[PDB]
Amino acid sequence: KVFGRCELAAAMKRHGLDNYRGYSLGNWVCAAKFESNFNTQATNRNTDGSTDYGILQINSRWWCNDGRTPGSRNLCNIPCSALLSSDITASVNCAKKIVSDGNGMNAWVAWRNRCKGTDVQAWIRGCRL
Ligand SMILES: CCCCCCCCCCCCOS(=O)(=O)O
User: Does residue 52 carry a catalytic annotation?
Assistant: First the structure.
């Protein structure tokens, strides 16, 4: 499903992602936009043979099992296909494990390249949250 900006924020914020680990809602929404364009069904295969899945493009090398990433790990105990659902719950939950790994939201390269140090408050501008 292709979420609207404010709808996604509300879901994100409904699931305890606002200010999680220090990153305000705008941060998580900004990443969604630039990772998947708010599309819970986006997939993107990496050079190394892994694939990023979902609203937040969670990588199969570490957090999910897709059956085609040899030597990879499945840290949030879940099938990568669960990351593609209209219900963002699994994504958020795994986002919470990734974001705690040690590098914060830098795990999402497109957050640091396109969100970090920006006015991430604008992504939730106008939302009734
Ligand atoms: C060659 C296929 C690989 C597909 C993608 C991810 C691999 C999942 C394997 C489980 C490791 C278990 O990980 S665990 O930390 O949750 O116990």
Answer: yes
Residue 124: name the closest of 42, 14, 49, 24 by CA. Answer: 24
Q: Which two tokens stand for residue 81?
A: 């296909």
Resolution in A: 2.3
Phi first, then psi: give them for residue 65, nearest 5 degrees: -100, 120
Nearest-atom number in ligand 1 for the CA of 64 is 6
Residue 67 Cβ contacting ligand 1 at under 6 Å: yes
8 Å CB contact between 3 and 38: yes
Given the residues 7, 18, 35, 48, the one annotated as active site? 35
Tally the C-alpha atoms within 13 A of residue 128's C-alpha that lie toward its C-beta.
0
Q: What is the CATH number of the domain that holds 42?
A: 1.10.530.10
What residue owns the CA closest to ligand 1's atom 1? 70
The domain tally of the chain equals 1
Tokens 């499945």 appear where?
A: 74
User: How far is Cα 81 from Cα 12, in angstroms, rounded to an integer?
Assistant: 19
Tell whether ligand 1 has an atom less than 6 A from the beta carbon of residue 75.
yes
Domain interval for residue 53? 1-129
